[PDB]
């Protein structure tokens, strides 16, 4: 209860905050290419009265940085905005476009500050940033509400975390490298959908999903149509 230390120093509002990130109910996964990066998220559209265009958990922050978030849409659109502008203000104030790993710092920084000074309740969302910067290439860093980020060679956010995970882990103990060997994104994409389908004991149509790709400085969201064609691709080859 409230934002100041427990008897075992663990102020739960931060802890509670987490369940809510998860609670949304969507699964987000991400992996590195070789000259590209990719994230998978599900696109469950219940109400037959909405419009799938307006739905999404992935947005174009920068010309090259995209973001996915397993978390409640209102709080996300916020984080989206601030971040979206921090980079905007950055390029201006410093001469060069802001990289993945950094945004995630002021971002975690920000969520830490809130938390400690009490100027608002933490947002209940986990942000997963992606891109490729010409200093560390395929970059992937994640941030949580307890104001904190780190690095992933490929990650996942969702109700079923460790499952999506373990698969990749096993696929990694064998592929032995710390990323996905392959030149084309289409091909990598195929790979992830693959590793997710296998991971849910579930199948997806051409609208049941949501995916994004980070290239050599030209990040773009995968749309309804192009999305299906990868299912075509990965049907026989399986």
């Amino acid at each position: 209860h409230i934002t100041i230390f427990s008897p075992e120093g663990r102020l739960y509002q931060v802890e509670y905050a987490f369940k809510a990130t998860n609670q949304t109910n969507i699964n987000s996964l991400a992996v590195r290419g070789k000259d590209c990066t990719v994230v998978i998220s599900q696109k469950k559209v219940p109400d037959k009265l909405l419009d799938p265009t307006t739905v999404s958990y992935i947005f174009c922050i920068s010309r090259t940085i995209g973001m996915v978030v397993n978390g409640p849409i209102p709080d996300a659109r916020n984080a989206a905005l601030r971040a979206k502008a921090e980079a905007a203000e950055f390029r201006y104030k410093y001469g060069y476009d802001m990289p993945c790993d950094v945004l995630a710092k002021r971002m975690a920084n920000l969520s830490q500050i809130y938390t400690q000074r009490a100027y608002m309740r933490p947002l209940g969302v986990i942000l997963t940033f992606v891109s490729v910067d010409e200093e560390l290439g395929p970059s992937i860093y994640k941030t949580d509400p307890a104001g904190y980020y780190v690095g992933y060679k490929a990650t996942a956010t969702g109700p079923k975390q460790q499952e999506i995970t373990t698969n990749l882990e096993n696929h990694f103990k064998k592929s032995k490298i710390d990323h996905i060997n392959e030149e084309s994104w289409e091909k990598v994409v195929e790979f992830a959908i693959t590793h997710m389908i296998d991971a849910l004991g579930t199948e997806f149509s051409k609208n049941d999903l949501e995916v994004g790709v980070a290239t050599k400085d030209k990040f773009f969201t995968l749309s309804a149509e192009n999305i299906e064609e990868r299912l075509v691709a990965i049907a026989e080859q399986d």
């Binding site: 509670y16 809510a20 998860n22 009265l49 419009d51 307006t54 659109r77 209940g124």
Partner: protein, 240 residues
């Protein structure tokens, strides 16, 4: 569970649920995205014979191209509209070009957003439906107390939302190519009547507005007058 900022043992903000709970309790509002432009309608409830008709408007325009309506706590609605009014007019002065409906929602979503962050403030007690046009077509969204909103083919809140919902459901399939600008109105006129059957012992007054490059001419005009009447009668026949 009693403060606005706080979270429940498994991540939940109760004050917002009750916010929602009050949104339902009020009158019913709807809206529909058609060929080009949109159509809205609300439920003014005549509680006595001492109410001047054609008077207390619940629907409001923004700029000169955005329709807008809601339900729940009436003053909350009004308040929210003002902020939306500044934001719009400020933007306009800045970029010259009338404000894109897509972003507009956020500007508002972001403002409704805040009132879920601090304990010293009260969550917005209204669900809001709206839309308008631009260059790349007409749009229509619906904002709730949580601040979460989206784009719908038609929306509904307040008391009987299902009535109009399943009602909106049909239209989709028989007219999977957008309903006629004209028919849109008269159809809305009906969808309301049907959903009113709770305040049935108590008479009422229906209000309608719309947008369309062909009909309104890019603008938002109040459906009043002749088209207004027949649109009622139209509803009055199917009302059996």
């Amino acid at each position: 569970d009693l403060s606005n900022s706080v979270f429940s043992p498994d991540g939940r903000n109760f004050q917002v649920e009750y916010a929602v709970k009050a949104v339902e309790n009020g009158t019913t509002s709807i809206g529909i995205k058609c060929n080009d432009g949109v159509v809205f309608a609300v439920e003014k409830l005549i509680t006595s014979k001492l109410l001047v008709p054609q008077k207390n408007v619940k629907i409001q325009v923004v700029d000169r191209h955005i329709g807008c309506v809601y339900s729940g706590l009436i003053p909350d609605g009004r308040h929210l509209v003002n902020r939306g009014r500044e934001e719009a007019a400020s933007f306009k002065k800045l970029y010259k070009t009338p404000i894109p409906i897509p972003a507009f929602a956020d500007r508002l979503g972001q403002y409704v957003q805040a009132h879920t962050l601090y304990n010293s403030v009260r969550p917005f007690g209204v669900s809001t439906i709206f839309g308008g046009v631009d260059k790349n077509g007409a749009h229509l969204y619906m904002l709730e107390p949580s601040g979460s909103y989206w784009g719908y083919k038609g929306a509904a809140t307040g008391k009987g939302r299902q009535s109009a919902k399943a009602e909106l459901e049909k239209l989709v399939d028989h007219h999977p190519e957008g309903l006629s600008a004209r028919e849109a109105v008269k159809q809305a006129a009906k969808i309301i009547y049907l959903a009113h059957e709770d305040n049935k012992e108590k008479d009422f007054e229906l209000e309608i507005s719309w947008c369309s490059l062909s009909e309104t001419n890019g603008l938002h005009k109040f459906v009043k007058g002749d088209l207004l009447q027949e649109a009622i009668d139209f509803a009055q026949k199917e009302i059996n």
